[PDB]
Write an enzyme that holds these catalytic residues in place. Structure first.
Site, short mmCIF file in Angstrom:
data_model
loop_
_atom_site.label_atom_id
_atom_site.label_comp_id
_atom_site.label_asym_id
_atom_site.label_seq_id
_atom_site.Cartn_x
_atom_site.Cartn_y
_atom_site.Cartn_z
N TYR A 11 0.81 -1.21 0.00
CA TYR A 11 0.00 0.00 0.00
C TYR A 11 0.85 1.27 0.00
O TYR A 11 0.47 2.26 -0.62
CB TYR A 11 -0.95 -0.03 1.20
CG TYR A 11 -1.40 1.32 1.71
CD1 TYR A 11 -2.28 2.11 0.99
CD2 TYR A 11 -0.95 1.79 2.94
CE1 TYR A 11 -2.70 3.34 1.46
CE2 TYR A 11 -1.36 3.02 3.42
CZ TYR A 11 -2.23 3.79 2.68
OH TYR A 11 -2.63 5.01 3.17
N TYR A 31 30.05 24.10 49.39
CA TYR A 31 29.22 23.09 48.74
C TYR A 31 29.87 22.54 47.47
O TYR A 31 29.76 21.35 47.19
CB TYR A 31 27.84 23.66 48.40
CG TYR A 31 26.90 23.80 49.58
CD1 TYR A 31 27.38 23.86 50.88
CD2 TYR A 31 25.53 23.88 49.38
CE1 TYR A 31 26.52 23.99 51.95
CE2 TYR A 31 24.67 24.01 50.43
CZ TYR A 31 25.17 24.07 51.71
OH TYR A 31 24.30 24.20 52.76
N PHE A 69 9.43 5.80 12.49
CA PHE A 69 10.26 6.94 12.11
C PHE A 69 10.20 8.09 13.11
O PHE A 69 10.87 9.10 12.89
CB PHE A 69 9.84 7.45 10.73
CG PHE A 69 8.36 7.59 10.57
CD1 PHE A 69 7.68 8.64 11.15
CD2 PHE A 69 7.63 6.63 9.88
CE1 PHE A 69 6.32 8.76 11.03
CE2 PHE A 69 6.27 6.75 9.75
CZ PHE A 69 5.61 7.81 10.32
N LIG Z 1 25.38 22.32 56.68
N LIG Z 2 6.05 8.36 6.29
#
Ligand SMILES: [N+]
Ligand SMILES: [N+]
Lengths: 671, 691
Positions: free
Chosen positions: A93, A320, A369
């Site tokens: 198809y 930190y 796709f």
């Molecule tokens: N702390």
């Molecule tokens: N397609």
């Protein structure tokens, strides 16, 4: 087609198994594959290291691409199934009218919709990415479900191995009909098709076949072969794959670099203790902490820093960027691993439509796709990359700041006179510009999907566009890494210089005191409490800390005990201070000279540390030198040498060498 | 195999299907008791406590087995301080350059709470406070993350917070002020110590002071005087950000399944081709999120009377139907699958965090060490909420694309324009207004898909030069969920509208065919006394011509000569007349056509109208195919349980009224069971592909 897998019918367990090992072992396997001189593909085992190997190579001399001949029967079977079904009537198809050959010609003509500019003003896809795409495109046609002739796959292989790269536009895909049509258009000899050779020379389609050794002339495509080539996610997934190679490597680097940061900062290594991170369960931070713990457990800097813990309670906790770096990097690494697996599945997938199912005898239409995994993974990895970059910026910012780097010089300046040496101040500005643009790139692209192509493609993945932004993000992270690495080696050398100066000041003070004051133990102590670089430029100056604190020590002893009292004051001012001013500047200078010539009495602690291979790589292999305003070399020149080293793959080995003694386990805590 | 770095335990959480994971989560959300011991708290339980007013809905219970290890670390602190010290925030200051040393432990705990009380509450009701649902979730998580025995707090404090949960007394917290959670959590501690500014709300919403809150909650002994480590143990933690993240991820997992189910109902009412769910297509791409999504949609479509009927039709007219399904239908499993994978990983990361020790320093009694570290850095929250929010946005964009196809007559394969239900489309603009609102929802959702963690500021004396921003990100993901619920509600109403329009369509079409054949026998075959095979073979051709035409293109004024039905029927008759040799029977053939039209025009309008009436009364000749479909529980839920009706310009109801009923039902938890009931018969496998 196989049967449903009873123990794992939806495939969750096999994908989870990919994530069961450690990240480092996964990176080690990845880089080993990128070093192999042969990539053999059969449709199911392609990994991001192999895509990176082919992308960075120019032709077969760097990496040779090999097709597995055991894939030929299934490939041919679905090709023949199309041809037989045509001969005996017709069906398919999506593939089949009245003129079949004209349809394959028109398919490619209208998808040749790219803008190339002049060919060299930024609107063509880099040949490195063209090559990666051709590799992924071949791999995703070898499962046998596409209905294309093996001979086409062999001809694209010749393009890879001779370094003939078709010319593709940079933009034009929402994920990849348009860019792939220029590969199909070279294969079919379209008059506008072009390519470049290994040496960069531009050629037409026929000259490209001659150079690549493709015989038999241009291909005339069968009904499904046009869709098989152009319909697929090969370009987005291939770029994503080379990006994830760099990302995994640089994620490990930020773990190593965090450990070296702690060494030069004299941080407390307790922040890597396994218990802390086991109690949060997150495997990314557990592995990150164990990696840093290993480096720090073999660091000469840390054995030296605990010796200072005995004679130091006005101290402060670490910031930190240092103390939380495992908690910060762990979740980034977890995201990067999941994105790698997603991409690795996509480059081993059938993503051309319709699927040719010979077993059941039908062309199966669908949406294979739709490159959603590429766009999701690239958006997630790009934000993780930006968070890694932000950590390097914060570590960098602490390291070059005198208020925060625990006795190192302002700006990591190395010269005797800091008035004529502003060190890494310029690179620091450049690190902020890198970090800002990187945070900008952290924004995602998949929330900008447009309803496309007559509203038939009302969702689309934007995979390649996302991959391109993540590649730019990787570039900036490499800029930040290069500059950071240079600053860390500068810090190492400043600690080496610091130690030798302090040793020379102690010996010199001890000597003069015994010769004049015939309480040494407390003069030594006063020297420990003062940072060398607060007085090393002019050690004899009476307004700088060294002379000021030594005087204060003696004045305190005298004022408390010993009124004339043997002319105590005269012994302080005259002999001691005069003697020190006369001898002290020559001794410091002699210590600076010994360091510069490599003959220092106290050896550089990097030589006895597991982080040494990175210092060696920068100082010996790349030839970067200690930076000082007394010379003319600029930091950019050294940053540039490291950056190019990283792009050429020269940092991977020394990075992993830092961890060659690691067993993959955290240090035991149970007792 | 061994698992020294915990990757295997994390990976095992991502084994098993998402639907089973979701079913367990919903079940836990319905247990009337939540028993916590510091290692089994899951998002279903956090969401259960959060949405309950008090213990009459869901009771929190502390595991007494944790009392000894909680006591050990608490007593360890007290012994050490009595003859020692040197513990940050205990004998030392807080934050950057905390070189300040002090000996007054208790006074230090008082000062900790005073200076962390930095939130702005506004007037208390103008949008600057944290919702009490989130305060409850944060209290649950804070308790859970203190029962591992590593935090050095008294068990009696945990029992007091438990009492606040079970009596429904919620301290008032600020909405903003955390980079992830000292400020907001200090208002829980401040209430526990009787701070003068502390407040709280009761189950009925009464604002009270600390003393009145201890009274209403039955806490005895008066306010607490915190011991050295107990201040940090309460305020140091990711409990607020992670608690909100958990309640957000409960909703996100439910709505992820919903998008999978609605995508299948979308295919049913669109008359899409179900082959897009075939397992081979998705197996060949390996991605498990897409394989589960496809198998879920395949199951719904395998038990759908809409698809079975579509097969039977296509067998008789093998011609036609070349037009392919658009991406929002055809790629929906490939679109959603990667989002589900992301959300599952995000959920597991949040679940580790709500069972983590996130306080500093850690108290390790087995080694006798106070470990300092960074377990307060809530990076797993900010990463999971940024990734989760982007996935939510992509899910919402699919709903908007499917909704946009469904309401457009160019694209919805024979349904009415705007899904209008009236006999006269001229006076029924249907869903045009909801469509505009769906675009406004989608645009704002895509905006929220942007992340927060790329906006970290160097904070607090530059001591916090990286911070997670976990709670801020959770708040934006919570807003994205709200919008996705807005989109889900409107979409569900439109899908039930489309179901009823298919029902109406088939009953009209059946009535047209029956009436056309009946009138064609009386007129075109009464002429069989002198023309047997003139228009005889056309009877099948008249039916063929009726099937190829959209009912709603003529259902109003069905016998009008300007509309397609009468236009096509004539062309069929005329074509056969002047093609099958008009000269063989010229005079009579064309006069019959005119009599055929006038006969039809006399009774077709009444037959079509009677078909519409029978549909609306529930006595239609052709049954509604939703009743014989696996998706029936969702339609039944909207129409019977919530009372939403078919929308039409002939009545007074506005679409927003029905959207609101569904939106409130979703928020009240009423959609989980119907959604899952669509999958009651699924064994977790895709259908075989080896036949
Ligand atoms: N702390
Ligand atoms: N397609």
């Amino acid at each position: 087609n196989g049967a449903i897998v009873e123990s794992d019918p939806l495939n969750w367990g096999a994908a989870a198994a990919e994530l069961s090992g450690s990240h480092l072992d996964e990176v080690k396997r990845m880089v080993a594959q990128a070093r192999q001189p042969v990539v053999k593909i059969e449709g199911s085992t392609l990994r991001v290291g192999q895509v990176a190997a082919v992308a960075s190579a120019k032709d077969a001399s760097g990496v040779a691409v090999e097709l597995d001949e055991e894939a030929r029967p299934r490939v041919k079977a679905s090709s023949e199934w199309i041809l037989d079904c045509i001969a005996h009537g017709g069906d398919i198809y999506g593939v089949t009218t009245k003129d079949g050959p004209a349809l394959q010609v028109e398919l490619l003509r209208h998808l040749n919709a790219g803008i190339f500019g002049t060919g060299s003003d930024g609107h063509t896809l880099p040949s490195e990415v063209v090559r990666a795409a051709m590799l992924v495109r071949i791999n995703t046609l070898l499962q046998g479900y596409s209905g294309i002739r093996f001979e086409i796959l062999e001809a694209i292989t010749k393009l890879l191995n001779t370094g003939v790269s078709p010319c593709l536009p940079l933009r034009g895909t929402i994920t990849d009909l348009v860019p792939l049509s220029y590969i199909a258009g070279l294969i079919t000899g379209r008059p506008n098709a072009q390519a470049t050779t290994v040496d960069g020379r531009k050629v037409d389609a026929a000259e490209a076949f001659k150079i690549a050794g493709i015989e038999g002339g241009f291909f005339k495509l069968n009904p499904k072969e046009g869709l098989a080539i152009v319909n697929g996610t090969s370009v987005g997934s291939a770029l994503a794959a080379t990006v994830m190679y760099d990302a995994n490597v640089l994620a490990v680097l930020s773990e190593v670099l965090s450990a070296i940061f702690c060494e030069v900062m004299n941080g407390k290594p307790e922040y890597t203790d396994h218990l802390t991170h086991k109690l949060k369960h997150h495997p990314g931070s557990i592995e990150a902490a164990a990696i840093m713990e290993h480096i720090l457990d073999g660091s000469a800097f840390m054995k030296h820093a605990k010796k200072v813990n005995e004679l130091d309670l006005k101290p402060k906790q670490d910031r930190y960027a240092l103390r939380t770096s495992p908690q910060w990097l762990g979740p980034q690494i977890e995201v990067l691993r999941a994105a790698t697996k997603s991409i690795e599945r996509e480059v081993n997938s059938v993503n051309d439509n319709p699927v040719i199912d010979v077993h059941r005898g039908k062309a199966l239409h669908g949406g294979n796709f739709q490159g959603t995994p590429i766009g999701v993974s690239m958006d997630n990895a790009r934000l993780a990359i930006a968070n890694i970059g932000k950590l390097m910026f914060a570590q960098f910012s602490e390291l070059v700041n005198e208020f925060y780097n625990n006795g190192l010089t302002s700006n990591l300046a190395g010269s005797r006179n800091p008035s004529l040496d502003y060190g890494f101040k310029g690179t620091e500005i450049a690190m902020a510009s890198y970090c800002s643009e990187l945070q900008y790139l952290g924004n995602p692209i998949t929330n900008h999907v447009q309803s496309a192509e007559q509203h038939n493609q009302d969702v689309n993945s934007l995979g390649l566009v996302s991959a391109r932004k993540t590649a730019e993000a990787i570039d900036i992270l490499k800029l930040m890494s290069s500059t950071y690495i240079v600053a860390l080696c500068q810090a190492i050398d400043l600690r080496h210089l610091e130690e030798n100066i302090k040793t020379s000041v102690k010996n010199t003070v001890t000597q003069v005191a015994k010769k004049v004051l015939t309480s040494e133990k407390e003069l030594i102590t006063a020297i420990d409490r003062e940072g060398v670089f607060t007085y090393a430029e002019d050690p004899a100056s009476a307004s700088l800390p060294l002379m000021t604190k030594l005087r204060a020590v003696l004045v305190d002893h005298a004022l408390s005990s010993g009124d004339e009292r043997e002319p105590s004051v005269f012994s302080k001012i005259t002999k001691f201070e005069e003697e020190l001013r006369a001898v002290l500047p020559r001794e410091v200078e002699a210590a600076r000279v010994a360091v510069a010539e490599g003959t220092a009495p106290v050896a550089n602690r990097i030589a006895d540390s597991r982080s040494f291979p990175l210092y060696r790589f920068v100082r010996e292999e790349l030839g970067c030198v200690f930076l000082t305003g007394e010379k003319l070399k600029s930091p950019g020149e050294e940053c540039t040498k490291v950056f190019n080293g990283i792009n050429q793959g020269k940092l991977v080995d020394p990075m992993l060498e830092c961890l060659k003694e690691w067993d993959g386990k955290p240090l035991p805590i149970n007792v």
